[PDB]
Amino acid sequence: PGSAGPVGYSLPLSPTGESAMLTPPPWHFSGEVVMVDYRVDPDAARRFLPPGLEPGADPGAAAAVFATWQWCSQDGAELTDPGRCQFGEFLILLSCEFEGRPMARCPYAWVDQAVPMMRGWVQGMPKQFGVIHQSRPVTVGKAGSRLAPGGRFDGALSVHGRRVVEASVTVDRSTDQPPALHDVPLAHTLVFPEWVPPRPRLVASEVSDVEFSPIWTGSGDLTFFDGLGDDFGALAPLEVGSGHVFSYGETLHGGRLLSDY
Amino acid sequence: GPVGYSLPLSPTGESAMLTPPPWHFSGEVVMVDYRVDPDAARRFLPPGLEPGADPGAAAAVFATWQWCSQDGAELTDPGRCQFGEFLILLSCEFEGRPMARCPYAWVDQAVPMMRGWVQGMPKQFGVIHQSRPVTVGKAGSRLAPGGRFDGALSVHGRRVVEASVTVDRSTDQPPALHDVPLAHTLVFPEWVPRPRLVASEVSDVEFSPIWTGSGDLTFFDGLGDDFGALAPLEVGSGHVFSYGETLHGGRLLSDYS
Amino acid sequence: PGSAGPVGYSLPLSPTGESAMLTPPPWHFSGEVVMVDYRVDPDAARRFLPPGLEPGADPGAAAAVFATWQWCSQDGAELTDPGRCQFGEFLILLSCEFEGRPMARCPYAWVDQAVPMMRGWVQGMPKQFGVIHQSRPVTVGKAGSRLAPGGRFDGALSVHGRRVVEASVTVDRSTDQPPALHDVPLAHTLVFPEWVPPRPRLVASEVSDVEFSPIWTGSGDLTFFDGLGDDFGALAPLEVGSGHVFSYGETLHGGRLLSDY
Amino acid sequence: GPVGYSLPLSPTGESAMLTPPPWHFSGEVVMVDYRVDPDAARRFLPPGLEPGADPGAAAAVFATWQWCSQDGAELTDPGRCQFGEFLILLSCEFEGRPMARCPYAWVDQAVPMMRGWVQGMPKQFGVIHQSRPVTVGKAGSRLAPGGRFDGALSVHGRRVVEASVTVDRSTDQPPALHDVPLAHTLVFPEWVPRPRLVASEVSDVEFSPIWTGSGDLTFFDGLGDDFGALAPLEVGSGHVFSYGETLHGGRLLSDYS
Numbered sequence A, C: 001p002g003s004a005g006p007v008g009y010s011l012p013l014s015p016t017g018e019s020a021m022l023t024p025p026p027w028h029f030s031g032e033v034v035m036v037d038y039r040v041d042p043d044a045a046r047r048f049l050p051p052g053l054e055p056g057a058d059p060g061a062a063a064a065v066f067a068t069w070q071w072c073s074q075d076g077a078e079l080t081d082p083g084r085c086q087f088g089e090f091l092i093l094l095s096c097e098f099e100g101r102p103m104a105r106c107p108y109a110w111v112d113q114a115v116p117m118m119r120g121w122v123q124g125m126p127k128q129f130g131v132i133h134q135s136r137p138v139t140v141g142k143a144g145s146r147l148a149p150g151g152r153f154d155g156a157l158s159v160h161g162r163r164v165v166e167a168s169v170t171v172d173r174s175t176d177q178p179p180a181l182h183d184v185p186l187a188h189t190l191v192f193p194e195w196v197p198p199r200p201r202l203v204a205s206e207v208s209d210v211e212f213s214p215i216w217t218g219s220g221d222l223t224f225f226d227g228l229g230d231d232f233g234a235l236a237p238l239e240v241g242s243g244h245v246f247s248y249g250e251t252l253h254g255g256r257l258l259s260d261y
Numbered sequence B, D: 001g002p003v004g005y006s007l008p009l010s011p012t013g014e015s016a017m018l019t020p021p022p023w024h025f026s027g028e029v030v031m032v033d034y035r036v037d038p039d040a041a042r043r044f045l046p047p048g049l050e051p052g053a054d055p056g057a058a059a060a061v062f063a064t065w066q067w068c069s070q071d072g073a074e075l076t077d078p079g080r081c082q083f084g085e086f087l088i089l090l091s092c093e094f095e096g097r098p099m100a101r102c103p104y105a106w107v108d109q110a111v112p113m114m115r116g117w118v119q120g121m122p123k124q125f126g127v128i129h130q131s132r133p134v135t136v137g138k139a140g141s142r143l144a145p146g147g148r149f150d151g152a153l154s155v156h157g158r159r160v161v162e163a164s165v166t167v168d169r170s171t172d173q174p175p176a177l178h179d180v181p182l183a184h185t186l187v188f189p190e191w192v193p194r195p196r197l198v199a200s201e202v203s204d205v206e207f208s209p210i211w212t213g214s215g216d217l218t219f220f221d222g223l224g225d226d227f228g229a230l231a232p233l234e235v236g237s238g239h240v241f242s243y244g245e246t247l248h249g250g251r252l253l254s255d256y257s
């Protein structure tokens, strides 16, 4: 009501607010996921947990998650421009707990589009830019795999021209049991660098209307390669477990404060 | 000396950019049938290719593909086996047999581009986007009545084509221009100072059920007056479906001798 | 000294701090610029000036600025990886004043790399992602222009697959007079969206060791196209003035608060 | 029917992806001379091309180019007239005359890639980065003693080559492998079930002063054992310079009849 200067949910500010790079939440997501469960060094994982987050009930449980998404705002406007509403993503997830409640920590994430990257920082998800590839199921022809026993699906991440992660799943059966780390709240750290010479906050992403397709599960394989530094390398798999292929949706509304310390 | 199906030659032949056919394709298509000026279409038909039984029938075709060679090796590297594509198709005939001519095509990966020229398909490079059906959540459309699917092509940073389909029913009737042989012109520029009309030989052609509904198509400036001549006079039905084929090689229609 | 959780100048946090996407300033920049001075609707320009910034001494003075940069941190480490240390940029600049002192406001900017984009938001420069092309001078052969009378240089910006801006300069003489809008402080608005249900600050970017090559100046041409919305379109040229081609360097240290309101 | 120097054919010929030669090039080069296993190099030489007077001499060449046709039209669209390139060169001879063979090349734009195959230059697609000299500020090197310049190539998301040069002096001596004719193999895959050895004809070859100093070069895995066979045994001098030429067409060295 009072406002004088230019406005907007985000930069760039403009007289009408229409120029802003980001739209206010809620945002809807619909995606396809290729995920591998793995065993991480629990002491290594612990060092990525900020104060307030404790080790998971199974401290060594981790996951590598490839996904391709479509997203839109409440009005659905972005959906008519597929170039604007799609992105690929790779995440690491670590098991943790907040006040006794299972959650996941995402210490590393990459995406291949700028809007999702910046929107990640708004939520505290530490998204960087990368090149991200993922197999898609086919239903006709021979050039791919079906969502059926024996179907194989692969994921790859490169960053700055170097291969960082490769994952594979060969599915053998369908279940109605969502993978644990993809079915708990994510606990992020909101912090942004200080330009004029920071107060981090631990937040949970608030979601609704979480939906999974049937889950196709089988063997998993996962390989980390050099090219992201030793801090990242500490989270490489000790052992690799089951892989999972499924579709996922949710609505993301905003943050809930877990601790402002 | 060094060998290979294609450049670069190498001692074992492994370095070649392209592998020998056959190649398998599995793709997701968003296609719009439209009416083109028949006189404009005729001017894109080389000798031997005559106007369709329906000279004005054309189509704009967006697709996303996975492909592989006979051994399937490319499938394990999604970054190497995937590409997006936009094509124009024109109805024509050769010796009384219905076919389609592709006067323009764009892809977003180099191997499929070069492989296109091998077959005579006139692929250039572009930026190509296409809606994907969803089955969970709210951020997209289902393959079901009322589902909408969009396609866009930009070239050299300029928007060139936008298409949309809103489906209303499923059928087992493949879109006509996507179910006839393609007749290409095999020609490569002379570097040291002879075109052939060929058809792509395919097998194991497979369609999913075809979701069909309204179609919409717009051409924008940015590719020149020759291309603009093929802009729609009227836009017909749209179709969303999956498609597979195996592509084996070429068959000579004419070498003009 | 006390720190427990993972750390870093920016996300992602890590045990050593090495994983952070951004490095602390200062950052050094060395670039090549193709710039066109133009006349903007002063009333339109005014609406992009937040409280505290007044219209420029010449309220209708604006510029369109294409640049290609190399950048590095104090240790110079980024320079050995050209893919990491280079980016292209397009900016709009508007003339304004703070407490009587000439400055420039950048209402819109685009870059083609993720690190520079995020670093822009840290400073309040409203960078989005785009495709940005710019001619470079040649010194041998025929496939280009020399930095000499008659030399022509072009710039183009596309965003989401649509052409947004095209500029051209044909130079006819060399001067030692830096273009006014490229030789004054930039006044940005620091603001980041609030995730847990904003306090903007007006800041100036503090720079040192500003250096210009000889300036090649001549006719300018500039065209805006649709595809960024009516707020942006309000800043299209009424008339187009001189163009300038030159090399530029500076060291960027941090922000100085102009007003926290 | 429709015409054109290259596909796609069109009624006026304007749609063609490629324009007829001559084409002008102006580029900035970062090059490292190195020693290759002569036996490995020999295996990449087709019949008619014999080992160099110095069989082990090779070079790794990074360049950034602007190009245009005779009318200069492409120059006004920087996005259409610019590309980056990485090449391997091997010393060889044809009928006693020194030449260079390019067994591998990569570029980052589609037109130059296709145009390469027209000439017989075995270009593939890659991601190619190269340092640029600066003249103001601190974020780079000057073309002056102690200046360092780096090059990198990735293909399909894997790093393949890194090179570096630290210059110490200026000379008027063009690097040998960048100052001899290139001998290519013109061949295109048969689609309906005959290579030629050709040289690229150039004129108006121009070098800036050559800044020369130490060179460093590393190959990484990621392209196969054939390519790996050309990895350096030893690395020599590096050179940073500007280069221009006009490329007119091909001259037949042999058609093997």
Ligand SMILES: *[C@H](C[C@@H]1CNC(=[NH2+])N1)C(=O)O
Binding pocket: A029, A089, A091, A115, A116, A117, A119, A120, A125, A252
């Ligand atoms: C980034 C984060 C989304 C939300 N959940 C994900 N796995 N990715 C964004 O908002 O685009």
Ligand SMILES: *[C@H](C[C@@H]1CNC(=[NH2+])N1)C(=O)O
Binding pocket: B067, B085, B111, B112, B113, B115, B116, B121, B247
């Ligand atoms: C290019 C051509 C393919 C075959 N049919 C198409 N619609 N695209 C290629 O071989 O990759």
Ligand SMILES: *[C@H](C[C@@H]1CNC(=[NH2+])N1)C(=O)O
Binding pocket: C029, C089, C091, C115, C116, C117, C119, C120, C125, C252
């Ligand atoms: C973004 C901003 C730089 C600083 N000045 C510019 N003109 N661009 C960044 O820090 O990379």
Ligand SMILES: *[C@H](C[C@@H]1CNC(=[NH2+])N1)C(=O)O
Binding pocket: D067, D085, D111, D112, D113, D115, D116, D121, D247
């Ligand atoms: C590819 C080949 C050019 C000519 N000489 C080079 N080093 N690259 C093209 O024609 O664009």
